[PDB]
Design a protein around this ligand. Structure first.
Ligand code: HEM
Ligand code: HEM
Ligand SMILES: Cc1ccc(N)cc1
Ligand SMILES: Cc1ccc(N)cc1
Lengths: 443, 444
């Protein structure tokens, strides 16, 4: 009933523990020492980090706990506003935008996005086939090039043309720089850093607002938002909220999904039996020069490989909840109304009582049957009505792209890459490089 | 444009296709061959059977289509009359009864019915823990005993005492024989009519007296809400004749339709042990008191998911009927004239691979984690619109309460490795489904 807590630093309490370049991984080390739950204090803030399925399955009770904006999300809200991802459930724009946007992220809506996703994926395939001998691939960089172009085309019919560029796009320069300024505030004479954030917000907001003005009919999210009306209230999304969704989708769509692709490829080159087994599935299912939507649904082992990458290194590694009323967590940790919880997703996915002893081994076979996994044991996309609305978009693009990659190339970990996880607000394997040898199969 | 139609039998057209003991299941085999729509003609009748969400989402447009009394409901109407379920939308007693009765079927109204539901549920649990070793359970029979007793107590404070009987109640004996005669007329005798009239007189005689007997006790029951309720629209209360028709309507809906859901739910749980263990863990973690509370019953989310996925595969009221208010075009390719009839084959709707993926036949309750993700009009086990099931919250509450206690108190064993056999009356039931229950010996 007494809750553990890591080392303290006087009046700063636990905050210097976050003054590190890899905070989620440092939080994982504490959870290994302190167990399924521990209190984390800071000046003016208190939260509790959960790491066991036993406690997280109760925190996932939507009747008792609701999504809370973590300190990181409060700072991202300064440029994503009340978009879907940084709004409170009780805000009117959340439920409104949620009802308008759900049809355009469904599994049936992916049949329309499929043609645009293949468009970007073929550019990735042709880049790797046009590499010279002994040239290598910078994996997370190309994966971000792909995920960023896919959301721009399917989201607003815009071409970032990331495969024609060495330097990133002007818009994402301020977006990435705003995210860095957002994260740095958590672990913190800072007037220049603050003035720059304001300048960067003006750049994003002005650029996106013009895209809305230019459009004001194509089968993309921007059209669905300009013409859709919420069946509940009968009102459409206003223009200010629309750019908040566009900024939210552009941020979410580019690096958290590229992270999954990079982790997936890394685990496949470190476990050649699994890669071989997934390459065989790609060859027997992708029988056309261009994959179809129906073939992508048939790449089941590719789907399990992605799920097993999400288990070990979920690229959105945590989310925050608050207690709607006074309650008791697990019959031994009483909580007051408003108290905050943090679901440390990478520790949850290592609970030995759920996954057995081989928690660190990459075996996509764990996901053969979705019914054998206990409830709330696998939460890479968040939870409940506040779960990821882009989940089916992300898994379809990742399965399609990974399938073409395994079909067209043999892969080689020529540097014996030692996993180094860079942490922003998402997770990525930094410096992960491979060589791709063509299989000389036409497109 | 040209609509497919099945095999014909001369001048009888397609009617001998329904001369079978499993007509809905036979219609599903036809829908698999002919696709999303097909025409079904009989002597003096034509209807069209819809099976895809694409077409059913247009048939559920209340401004174009209204509820129609199918041939099955017309024969039920001979003893349920203009009750809520067998009246036309434009009949004055529907909108009148619908406004008086909706308050007594709301989610806030289940807080009053909960105490009586637990009363019957405890009797089911105690029957099963009092079984001897190697004794088995007859699932749909016991589920029927509970659902009939729950609606009798919550509807009119009457105890059918079904757990003290081997032979069914005298009232339901005549009702069940009336439903059998109603169904037999569809695939079709002077002797049947005499008993049918005798059977109809028995139902009117018990209920007319039960209404006459109630009149001044005030109880938290439908009968009280019907004797004192006034329609805010017209300002009138329901008269005696309509009241007995609702009671018969509720008694028929309460006993067989809801117990089918429980029996199908348990059959799917014993065939998918991973789901049952997952539902048993939730039941053990939520039902912490010897008697469940109303709020603990709202917390068994996965049990609710188990019921919903049971309703998807085998919706126990497997069809409803619509007619075109005016001339319109269905799906852009099928022209329809005002008055044309449609039939929604719910089991085929719930198997549309374009909505549920390929694994439509698999029992995965995880489809219902987020109810907003499923497209519009894709899941219609309780009908559609203002003519949708008024007892939906009442059925799910009882079924969630009862399934929760069963998963809490017993382990279940499919000792005969039961091959599913679906008996068809007007509703669906797994016939002969049996299980053994080993107690977990938790007190009540
Ligand atoms: C593999 C890639 C992805 C992962 C692991 C992921 C993960 C997550 C997680 C964990 C949350 C909940 C965070 C919280 O509870 O505060 C979330 C929410 C959200 N994600 Fe994703 N996401 C991915 C891709 C995407 C994509 C491609 C989009 C769309 C472009 C997207 C858009 C959103 C939105 C809008 C929300 C908030 C929805 C709401 O609150 O109603 N995500 N995601
Ligand atoms: C899981 C169990 C149940 C299922 C699957 C179910 C299904 C349905 C369906 C499909 C309809 C519409 C039929 C049509 O369009 O002709 C309906 C209507 C109706 N149900 Fe249920 N039902 C269930 C339980 C109950 C219960 C327990 C009651 C109350 C005792 C009830 C009372 C009614 C009534 C009165 C109507 C007609 C309402 C109107 O037209 O205004 N049902 N139900
Ligand atoms: C917190 C968060 C992380 C990733 C995504 N896509 C959405 C939200
Ligand atoms: C037609 C009909 C179907 C189900 C119920 N409960 C009542 C009537």
């Amino acid at each position: 009933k007494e809750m553990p807590q890591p080392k303290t630093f006087g009046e700063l309490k636990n905050l210097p523990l976050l003054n590190t370049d890899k905070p989620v991984q440092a939080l994982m080390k504490i959870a290994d020492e302190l167990g399924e739950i521990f209190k984390f204090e800071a000046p003016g803030r208190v939260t509790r980090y959960l790491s066991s399925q036993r406690l997280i399955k109760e925190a996932c009770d939507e009747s008792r706990f609701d999504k809370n904006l973590s300190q990181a999300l409060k700072f991202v809200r300064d440029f994503t506003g009340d978009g879907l991802a940084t709004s409170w459930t009780h805000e009117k724009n959340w439920k409104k935008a949620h009802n308008i946007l759900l049809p355009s992220f469904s599994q049936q809506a992916m049949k329309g996005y499929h043609a645009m996703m293949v468009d970007i994926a073929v550019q990735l395939v042709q880049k790797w086939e046009r590499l010279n001998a002994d040239e290598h691939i910078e994996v997370p960089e190309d994966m971000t090039r792909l995920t960023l172009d896919t959301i721009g085309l399917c989201g607003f019919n815009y071409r970032f043309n990331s495969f024609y560029r060495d330097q990133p796009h002007p818009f994402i320069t301020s977006m990435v720089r705003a995210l860095d300024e957002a994260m740095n505030k958590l672990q913190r004479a800072y007037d220049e850093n603050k003035r720059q954030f304001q300048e960067d917000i003006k750049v994003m907001n002005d650029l996106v607002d013009k895209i809305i003005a230019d459009r004001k009919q194509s089968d993309d999210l921007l059209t669905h938002m300009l013409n859709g009306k919420d069946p509940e209230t009968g009102e459409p999304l206003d223009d200010e909220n629309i750019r908040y969704q566009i900024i939210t989708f552009l941020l979410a769509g580019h690096e958290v999904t590229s992270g999954l692709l990079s982790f997936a490829l890394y685990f496949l080159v470190k476990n050649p039996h699994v890669l071989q087994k997934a390459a065989e599935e790609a060859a027997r299912v992708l029988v056309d020069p261009v994959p179809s939507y129906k073939q992508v649904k048939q790449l089941k082992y590719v789907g399990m490989v992605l799920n097993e990458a999400l288990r070990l290194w979920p690229t959105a590694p945590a989310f925050s909840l608050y207690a709607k009323e006074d309650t008791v967590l697990g019959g031994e940790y009483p909580l007051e109304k408003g108290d905050e919880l943090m679901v440390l997703i990478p520790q949850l996915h290592r609970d030995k009582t759920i996954w057995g002893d081989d928690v660190e081994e990459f075996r996509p076979e764990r996901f053969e049957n979705p019914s054998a996994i206990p409830q709330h044991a696998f939460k890479p996309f968040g939870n409940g009505q506040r779960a990821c609305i882009g989940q089916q978009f992300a898994l379809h693009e990742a399965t399609l792209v990974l399938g073409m990659m395994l079909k067209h190339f043999d892969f080689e970990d020529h540097t014996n890459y030692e996993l180094d996880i860079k942490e922003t607000l998402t997770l990525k394997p930094e410096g992960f490089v491979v060589k791709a040898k063509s299989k000389k199969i036409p497109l």
